[PDB]
Enzyme design. Structure first.
Site, PDB file in Angstrom:
ATOM      1  N   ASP A   1      47.447  52.432  39.844  1.00 20.02           N
ATOM      2  CA  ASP A   1      46.442  51.398  39.642  1.00 20.02           C
ATOM      3  C   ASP A   1      45.110  52.015  39.239  1.00 20.02           C
ATOM      4  OD1 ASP A   1      45.436  48.678  39.717  1.00 20.02           O
ATOM      5  OD2 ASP A   1      44.446  49.191  41.609  1.00 20.02           O
ATOM      6  N   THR A   2      44.507  51.473  38.184  1.00 19.80           N
ATOM      7  CA  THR A   2      43.169  51.862  37.766  1.00 19.80           C
ATOM      8  C   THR A   2      42.578  50.706  36.972  1.00 19.80           C
ATOM      9  OG1 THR A   2      41.894  53.773  36.985  1.00 19.80           O
ATOM     10  CG2 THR A   2      43.541  52.875  35.498  1.00 19.80           C
ATOM     11  N   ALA A   3      41.243  50.643  36.955  1.00 18.18           N
ATOM     12  CA  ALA A   3      40.562  49.545  36.273  1.00 18.18           C
ATOM     13  C   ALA A   3      40.901  49.525  34.788  1.00 18.18           C
ATOM     14  CB  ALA A   3      39.051  49.654  36.479  1.00 18.18           C
TER      15      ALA A   3
ATOM     16  N   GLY B   1      45.690  42.723  33.436  1.00 16.11           N
ATOM     17  CA  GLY B   1      44.518  42.055  33.963  1.00 16.11           C
ATOM     18  C   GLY B   1      43.271  42.911  33.944  1.00 16.11           C
ATOM     19  N   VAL B   2      42.341  42.602  33.042  1.00 16.00           N
ATOM     20  CA  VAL B   2      41.025  43.238  32.991  1.00 16.00           C
ATOM     21  C   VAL B   2      40.003  42.114  32.884  1.00 16.00           C
ATOM     22  CG1 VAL B   2      39.465  44.778  31.735  1.00 16.00           C
ATOM     23  CG2 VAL B   2      41.897  45.362  31.944  1.00 16.00           C
ATOM     24  N   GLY B   3      39.271  41.857  33.973  1.00 19.30           N
ATOM     25  CA  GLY B   3      38.295  40.791  33.992  1.00 19.30           C
ATOM     26  C   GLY B   3      38.532  39.592  34.910  1.00 19.30           C
TER      27      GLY B   3
ATOM     28  N   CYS C   1      36.071  40.741  40.497  1.00 18.93           N
ATOM     29  CA  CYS C   1      35.816  41.570  39.328  1.00 18.93           C
ATOM     30  C   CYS C   1      34.530  41.119  38.641  1.00 18.93           C
ATOM     31  CB  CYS C   1      37.006  41.502  38.374  1.00 18.93           C
ATOM     32  SG  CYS C   1      36.797  42.430  36.873  1.00 18.93           S
TER      33      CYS C   1
HETATM   34  N1  5GP Z   1      36.816  44.898  38.622  1.00 19.69           N
HETATM   35  C1  5GP Z   1      37.385  44.806  39.824  1.00 19.69           C
HETATM   36  N2  5GP Z   1      38.642  44.371  39.924  1.00 19.69           N
HETATM   37  C2  5GP Z   1      39.075  44.318  41.194  1.00 19.69           C
HETATM   38  C3  5GP Z   1      38.373  44.668  42.367  1.00 19.69           C
HETATM   39  N3  5GP Z   1      39.170  44.478  43.480  1.00 19.69           N
HETATM   40  C4  5GP Z   1      40.332  44.018  42.975  1.00 19.69           C
HETATM   41  N4  5GP Z   1      40.322  43.904  41.607  1.00 19.69           N
HETATM   42  C5  5GP Z   1      41.401  43.383  40.739  1.00 19.69           C
HETATM   43  O1  5GP Z   1      41.552  41.998  40.977  1.00 19.69           O
HETATM   44  C6  5GP Z   1      42.904  41.721  41.433  1.00 19.69           C
HETATM   45  C7  5GP Z   1      42.901  40.568  42.406  1.00 19.69           C
HETATM   46  O2  5GP Z   1      42.517  39.356  41.771  1.00 19.69           O
HETATM   47  P1  5GP Z   1      42.373  37.997  42.591  1.00 19.69           P
HETATM   48  O3  5GP Z   1      43.777  37.591  42.977  1.00 19.69           O
HETATM   49  O4  5GP Z   1      41.531  38.368  43.794  1.00 19.69           O
HETATM   50  O5  5GP Z   1      41.622  37.115  41.613  1.00 19.69           O
HETATM   51  C8  5GP Z   1      43.388  43.056  41.977  1.00 19.69           C
HETATM   52  O6  5GP Z   1      44.802  43.153  42.040  1.00 19.69           O
HETATM   53  C9  5GP Z   1      42.750  44.052  41.018  1.00 19.69           C
HETATM   54  O7  5GP Z   1      43.483  44.113  39.799  1.00 19.69           O
HETATM   55  C10 5GP Z   1      37.011  45.132  42.226  1.00 19.69           C
HETATM   56  O8  5GP Z   1      36.226  45.444  43.124  1.00 19.69           O
HETATM   57  N5  5GP Z   1      36.615  45.168  40.903  1.00 19.69           N
END
Ligand code: 5GP
Ligand code: ATP
Ligand code: ATP
Ligand code: ATP
Ligand code: 5GP
Ligand code: 5GP
EC number: 1.7.1.7
Lengths: 473, 473, 473
Positions: C245-247, C295-297, C302
């Site tokens: 996992d990475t951004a 998933g980016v954004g 995020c």
């Molecule tokens: N940019 C960003 N993405 C995050 C962070 N924490 C989690 N994510 C992403 O958001 C996903 C969760 O999305 P959610 O279900 O909360 O909308 C995670 O699996 C990961 O891909 C964060 O602090 N920053």
């Protein structure tokens, strides 16, 4: 009553002006105190429900009488409705309560409305007089508003034949999902319901019963018209006590009505009011009243103070009038302004034999009005006054419809007040628990074993405005 | 006590109703006043923490005793828990305080919640009993909620051996980023902490200690069950003072309780209450009580006024009871209704030897309850009453669950009040500063150098509602 | 996917932009749909819990896996904590749940705090490993906050041996006052609990299990440090699936990390992400990933869009990436932005094999964080981001305290959002009911009997802002 040294203020006192000083006590437990009255009303607790259409109904009459109080039916209630109400109350069981009943074909929406006519939290579905299931507020949620009660009704419920001991019924309900026990008559039909709290209350409160062992009920009459004939009909209809009620009790027309009713030798206790003076208490007793109802001004629906400036602080009025009545062998009812258990206790300390409560009891499930909800979802009911039903009226025989509106122009209107229900404990019996728990605790603080000793032993004192605010609200 | 000429009201007085007239004074400094009590309690300030589970915990017992007060453990606390509390309190250092401690493996979330159990502003991270670092609220901000304490802890902190002069520790913390000095035993284990304010307080407050130099602590017992055996058990656990507590102290069952305890010859000052009359004060002293606890009604958690009409304005209750106890060589504790320093001062002026403070101290870091936050994010904590733990109860042996529910229906409920913390100074020691700073000022205004001179020299007056409104809130 | 004729917008689509058009269906009911995934994850429902410290705790991992999902443990969890979580989860029963347990010496205050760790509505009182009673939130009301659990416990509870048929346990609880059945091991000790809904859910959901029949669990790793060594340890600790996992997944350092983990031939499915492009999807598959996380954004924590402008509407992202992955025999996980069952359905219709959910599941009992309450007592928990735990960071060897602060200045902060619990149904399993109920209905509307047929047969259309507003919220 004794007041503390130097407590002789230059004003008359309300319930908020005074406090009770505890004395030396050997009265161990609250249940060692005898709360029964000595005035001939027959009440085993010092609580009378006021003759007000907002409060005194058939459900209220049944519920309070079973717990030792008595309910005065409001004046000018048609004689057929009186007898209908008396017959209903005196056919009630002394332990088992009357439940809300539902048809299997009634709608869930109708069941939700009728459930709050009693404090049982459940209603009984009846087919051919026999209980077939229980309906709860929870079963009504999440279902089609117009679904039939036959669908959401619970078929499994605790049942026991009427006459079973409350302690046994209490034990049957211990592990029951619903705290209602359906009581079955000899032929299997519906007798009533008993809850765990209802079973406990049976071992605390002594029912107020007549010579036949049936619940006590009272009726009121105004001083207009033929008072002797009306009082006689009320007696023949089965009333155990009569109340001759008017706004201004120290009045020639009231003295006539008492004599007219006393001369009929009906054999029932005669209450008359209202007055706030020792002179008025004496004149009413000498006219043939055994009990004097005291209170002009303090009533929650009473606008007399702002309209006329006439009134008297209630605690001082009850002290002077109960002293006057006791010298003459009579009794005094403290009527009006009761909002808290301490008001009942202080009125008994002041020398009243019974305390009459009106508006406070409008905010209960059992009062006749419709259950309402304000802006904040809080449950409430509206209390309203008797208005012209407590006033003196000239003979309307041969009255022009012009004269009908002429006399109506000045007559006191019906004022309204919001009485909120306790969101947890909304039944009138919960307030009786409230009231009688406080008064029992007052007697143990004073050293009194009964209501007579409470008035004999009480030490009172006067406080300033900051004094009342001590403690917790 | 002397009142101004002609100030002879027709009512009893609360703390709000009276004021102190300044007299001629040569008392030079606030610090020249001696706040020690003469009633045998051992307190060096006239502050006693009430026997309530909402306030009287071990953190409160340690903190108040170190500053000269005493805490009364609540009645019915299991004897094994009493012994742990006493042993914890009596093993505390007289100058250095017990901090919040954390393991390196604790979560940041847990640390953040435990920081407000004390008022130091930092928790000490401990490994094998030895300090390895400090954790502050600021170190917990912005970090992952479940990161380990080891990752946010500061390894640089001021440390000194236990027994170092508070003056020197004060100087060592002058330019420290964290105002906590970590105090170590000779083997390097944690002995406690001392802040700059805690070093100042060591030179102002005299710890309340027993014959062996260990912090003083008291225990309460109710008049139900076997009072003698319970009292003896509390004595063997190490209690320095016993409090026989009940809502209505002027009754037979309390008189017998005092006698049963006095005849066991336990060797401790005996407190009994509560009463509000001179007759009650005499009857408790004659039964063997050395201190009379006064207060029926004023308690912030007390609903007795609204429930029963029973009560007495606390100031007049203390004046009458202190005079009665003094003629018999006894003392009076003023119990209940204290909200401001003036209430402590006025209670002492009225002749009380000591002032019991309850719900006010619930709104502190050191009280047992959890620290809450309201709709405006202000910190507060809930105070709640002892309820049936102060009431008389008939023997429950062999009682059916029906009888259990019967007596339970009428038992006093637990009322709740919100006590907000000072958003700046939320520790109980800050309140102690507030309280004693004012009581010292009261003495300088009166001209008294000590608590007895305060009662002897005070001139009091009565005011109207507007009289209290003068000044600033 | 197929779009309606002419629905070719000049922009990319979010979940709010698209709708599913019903097709001709022969699918009888919701239960005839097969929700199991084909990506090698082993889930029997298309739900994956995100690798986030706010959500992916041991209680979540057990609860979700029993219902057919899988939970990805957050990266950087120490390997010892990884091992203990795996061992706990893999030792859970496939039907019976793990309850909250209490000692009789626990305080009432601690009891109602621990109760909300699970959705059962009751805790089991344990004495020497044997169940002696149940505690409900009702039992905690009205009693002293610091009373012991012993005083409020209910000794009466439904019990059955573990391995009893779920239909039987369901019937045993029909008329029970408490909807918790205490399941016992053969020796009588506590095996766990099962509710009426827990028994129902056993007949709807298929547990996701490894080859040994133990509940599945996944673990994540970041691309910093020694990724191969980290992944090898996670596999030996028992992880059934690995998430790299990475951004910004479309970068050289991620491609290296995939090749390093693939070349160890660990035999586990390999998820890698995150990308939003077809080229990114192909490069990650060709580097050795079998599943690409997309998933980016869109993630609720995020802030990438507002900080950088980088991101892609998630529906178009998934559509493009799933198609590219299909050509290489791979699969796509839709990660981020899931707020409603519709989002899960749309992600699968777009061609994702599984849907990763984060912040939404923080608002449940089983999430690691503490249960909180806002101004109106509405329950909620905070979700927060993983932040720098998803970011590339250079080797920290030789890091001065200056260098640590230099790199921390531009570090991503931890964003916070309040996720409210549904006041009626606060457990994650109720959300699973909500999610899978909608996804099953989507399939019956489309005419699909399974998830592959859903993506093969679906017809989609584009709507405007008013189109989304149709219906009920
Ligand atoms: N940019 C960003 N993405 C995050 C962070 N924490 C989690 N994510 C992403 O958001 C996903 C969760 O999305 P959610 O279900 O909360 O909308 C995670 O699996 C990961 O891909 C964060 O602090 N920053
Ligand atoms: N014929 C009538 N004329 C005037 N008022 C009446 C008449 N019958 C009843 N009332 C009044 O209507 C109110 C309703 O009381 P009632 O005794 O009829 O029933 P209740 O106690 O409300 O119970 P339920 O809901 O079962 O009818 C009371 O204030 C009563 O005095
Ligand atoms: N065994 C027990 N039974 C009933 N009440 C208890 C028991 N032990 C403690 N209490 C009550 O719980 C509260 C807190 O007690 P404790 O001695 O833990 O104090 P504390 O200062 O809050 O300590 P800490 O915060 O370090 O746990 C007090 O009201 C105390 O009377
Ligand atoms: N040693 C650790 N270092 C960092 N994070 C950890 C560590 N142990 C657990 N966590 C995190 O704490 C959270 C909760 O983990 P877990 O559910 O295993 O804790 P727990 O305390 O055993 O649970 P519970 O609250 O049910 O008792 C998760 O986000 C997990 O990643
Ligand atoms: N002035 C006035 N008094 C009323 C009216 N209705 C009832 N009362 C009085 O108020 C009493 C009830 O007082 P409460 O209990 O509501 O304080 C009644 O018993 C009666 O004496 C009304 O309409 N006007
Ligand atoms: N009547 C009553 N008094 C209480 C209760 N709890 C505590 N008290 C009294 O109130 C005192 C504390 O008053 P406070 O300082 O909180 O105003 C106690 O020391 C005790 O005398 C309760 O539940 N009921």
């Amino acid at each position: 009553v004794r007041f503390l040294d130097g407590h002789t203020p230059a004003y008359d006192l309300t319930y908020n002006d005074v406090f009770v000083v505890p004395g030396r006590s050997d009265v161990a437990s609250r249940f060692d105190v005898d709360l029964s009255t000595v005035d001939g009303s027959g009440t085993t607790i010092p609580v009378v429900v006021a003759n007000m259409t907002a409060v005194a109904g058939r459900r209220m009459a049944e519920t309070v009488a079973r717990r030792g109080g008595i309910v005065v039916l409001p004046q000018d209630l048609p004689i057929t409705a009186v007898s209908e109400t008396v017959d209903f109350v005196k056919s009630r069981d002394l332990v088992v309560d009357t439940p809300v009943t539902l048809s299997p074909e009634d709608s869930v929406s109708d069941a939700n409305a009728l459930l709050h006519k009693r404090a049982h939290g459940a209603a009984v579905v009846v087919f051919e007089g026999r209980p077939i299931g229980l309906v709860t507020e929870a079963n009504c949620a999440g279902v089609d508003r117009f679904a039939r009660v036959r669908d959401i009704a619970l078929s499994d419920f605790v049942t026991a034949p009427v006459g079973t001991d409350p302690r046994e019924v209490f034990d049957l309900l211990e592990h029951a999902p619903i705290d209602v026990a359906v009581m079955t008559a000899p032929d299997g039909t519906l007798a009533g319901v008993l809850t765990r709290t209802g079973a406990i209350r049976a071992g605390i409160y002594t029912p107020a019963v007549d010579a036949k062992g049936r619940l006590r009920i009272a009726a009121a009459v105004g001083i207009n018209g033929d008072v002797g004939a009306k009082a006689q009909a009320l007696a023949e209809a089965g009333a155990d006590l009569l109340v001759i009620d008017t706004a201004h009790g120290h009045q020639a027309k009231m003295l006539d009505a008492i004599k007219a009713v006393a001369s009929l030798d009906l054999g029932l206790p005669l209450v008359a009011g209202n007055v706030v003076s020792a002179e008025g208490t004496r004149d009413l007793i000498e006219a043939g009243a055994s009990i004097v109802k005291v209170g002009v001004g303090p009533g929650a629906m009473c606008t007399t103070r702002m309209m006329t400036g006439v009134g008297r602080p209630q605690f001082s009025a009850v002290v002077e009038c109960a002293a006057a009545a006791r010298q003459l062998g009579g009794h005094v009812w403290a009527d009006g302004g009761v909002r808290h258990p301490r008001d009942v206790a202080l009125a008994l300390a002041a020398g009243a034999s019974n305390v009459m409560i009106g508006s406070w009891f409008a905010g209960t499930y059992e009062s006749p009005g419709d259950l309402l909800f304000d802006r904040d979802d809080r449950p409430y009911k509206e209390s309203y006054g008797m208005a012209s039903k407590r006033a003196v009226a000239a003979r309307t025989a041969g009255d022009s419809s012009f004269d009908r509106a002429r006399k109506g122009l000045f007559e006191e209107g019906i004022s309204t007040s919001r009485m909120s229900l306790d969101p947890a404990r909304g039944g009138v019996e919960d307030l009786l628990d409230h009231i009688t728990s406080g008064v029992r605790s007052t007697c143990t603080y004073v050293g009194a074993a009964n209501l007579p000793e409470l008035h004999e032993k009480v030490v009172l004192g006067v406080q300033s405005a900051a004094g009342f605010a001590e403690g917790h609200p």
